[PDB]
Amino acid sequence: APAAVDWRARGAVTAVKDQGQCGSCWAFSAIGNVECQWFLAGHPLTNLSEQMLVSCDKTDSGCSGGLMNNAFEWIVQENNGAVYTEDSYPYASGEGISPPCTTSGHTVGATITGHVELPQDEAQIAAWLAVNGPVAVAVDASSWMTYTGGVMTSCVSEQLDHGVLLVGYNDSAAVPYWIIKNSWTTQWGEEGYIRIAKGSNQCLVKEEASSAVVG
Ligand SMILES: *[C@@H](C(=O)O)[C@H](O)C(=O)N[C@@H](CCc1ccccc1)C(=O)NCCC(C)C
């Protein structure tokens, strides 16, 4: 609802995780979005498995990268809409390799039916996020190793290289900003989060926005 929305303050977001040495940002962005969308559909907030995607999603490339839209379609088209709990399939790719996929011995924590791709417009993305919840986005995170806190008012915006999760915004602050959940532990940034200015396509935030649809 227009002025400021923060889904972390509405019990809709899990704790910050760690991707380690694996190039699995795509899986953390897709699962973080599913966890939020599952809660907002009237279910308890449950931690879900990124490892399920890194090891079993063959339409993406494990620790060499992927795309959240291919991950969402693999869940629906190849895994019968199932997303396992993180406890039944823990992260095992922190050293930079993805072990072979195991198709059993896991528990279904959530299900989805599809996904939507959102417009390349920050005002339109804020409007959808305000009502339907957190959105998976891709950014140029090349300048993010120097982020120590506060609102980043200028960001290098040349090439998308990192998938993250948009969890809110604040249009009433001195400079309007986006609130983003990252997967580089709570020791990075603002306890694992980053605020970037909103309205000028900082870090190319409006280019690849999408979300799973559950129901
Ligand atoms: C992100 C990471 O920091 O771990 C990881 O390198 C990654 O998945 N990068 C992809 C490119 C950036 C991006 C992410 C999500 C959506 C759009 C762009 C990546 O290399 N994609 C590979 C595509 C597959 C099909 C080979």
The domain locations on the chain are 1-215
22 CA distance to ligand 1 middle (Å): 11
**Fold held by 1-215:** Cathepsin B; Chain A (3.90.70)
Does residue 23 have its Cβ closer than 6 Å to ligand 1? Answer: yes
Helix 25-40 and helix 68-78, axial crossing angle in degrees, nearest 10: 60
Phi, psi of 46 (to 5 degrees): -120, 135
* Kind of pairing between the strands at 4-6 and 162-170: antiparallel
Residue 66 neighbours by CB under 8 Å, 6+ apart: 24, 26, 27, 53, 57, 60
Distances from the Cα of 187 to the Cα of 29, 56, 78, angstroms: 19, 29, 36
User: Do 76 and 113 form a contact (C-beta atoms < 8 A)?
Assistant: yes
Q: Which residue CA neighbors atom 8 of ligand 1 most closely?
A: 65
Residue nearest to atom 22 of ligand 1 (CA): 66
Q: Specify the resolution in Å.
A: 2.0
Residue 34 has φ and ψ, to the nearest 5°, of -65, -40
Catalytic residues: 25, 162, 182
Å from CA of 112 to ligand 1 middle:
22
Q: Is 31 exposed, middle or buried (0-12, 13-18, 19+ CB in 10 A)?
A: buried
Task: Please say whether the dihedral angle defined by the alpha carbons of residues 97, 101, 107 and 113, taken in this order, is positive or negative.
Answer: positive
